[PDB]
Amino acid sequence: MENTSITIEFSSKF
């Protein structure tokens, strides 16, 4: 979503 919190929270967690 052009951010560094949600897109990273998922891309990292999973």
UniProtKB/Swiss-Prot annotation:
Modification after translation (UniProt): Four species of SH have been detected in infected cell cytoplasm: a 7.5 kDa non-glycosylated form (SH0), a 13-15 kDa form that contains one or two N-linked carbohydrate side chains of the high-mannose type (SHg), a 21-30 kDa polylactosaminoglycan-modified form of the protein (SHp), and the isoform generated by alternative translational initiation. Of these different forms, SH0 is by far the most abundant protein detected during virus infection. Tyrosine phosphorylated.
Stretches in topological domain Intravirion: 1-14
Region Interaction with host BCAP31: start-end pairs: 6-14
Domain of life the protein comes from: Viruses
Coiled coil residues, start to end: none
Localisation per UniProt entry: Virion membrane; Host cell membrane; Host Golgi apparatus membrane; Host endoplasmic reticulum membrane
The protein's role, per its UniProt record: Viroporin that forms a homopentameric ion channel displaying low ion selectivity. May play a role in virus morphogenesis and pathogenicity at various stages of the viral life cycle. Accumulates at the membrane of the Golgi apparatus in infected cells and may facilitate virus release by modifying the secretory pathway. May enhance host membrane permeability and disrupt cellular ion homeostasis, which can be sensed as damage-associated molecular patterns/danger signals, triggering NLRP3 inflammasome activation and inflammatory immune response.
Quaternary structure note: Homopentamer forming a funnel-like pore. Interacts with glycoprotein G; this interaction occurs on the surface of virion particles and infected cells. Interacts with host BCAP31 (via C-terminus); this interaction is direct.
Family: Belongs to the orthopneumovirus small hydrophobic protein family.
Stated name of the protein: Small hydrophobic protein
Native source organism of the sequence: Human respiratory syncytial virus A (strain A2)
Shown part of the complete sequence: 1 to 14 of 64
